[PDB]
């Protein structure tokens, strides 16, 4: 990773790599990666438009 602006998961802002599991959301459709937004990679499949963290929160009992 030497490339300076580039992608960056929302969880912890890993490099754009084609091996991890990313997850796909539908509010905002960004990035991330199954285990960051508390996903398996072998549970995705029955997954279809998972509700990533990143927006879940939204309107939160405990954070608004
Ligand atoms: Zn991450
Ligand atoms: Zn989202």
């Not at 960004?30 to 879940?56: D, L, N």
């Amino acid at each position: 990773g030497s490339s300076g602006s580039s992608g960056q998961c929302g969880a912890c802002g890993e490099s754009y790599a084609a091996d991890e599991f990313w997850i796909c959301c539908d509010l905002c459709e960004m990035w991330f990666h199954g285990k960051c937004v508390k996903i398996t990679p072998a549970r995705a499949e029955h997954i279809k438009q998972y509700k990533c963290p990143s927006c879940s929160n939204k309107s939160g009992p405990s954070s608004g």
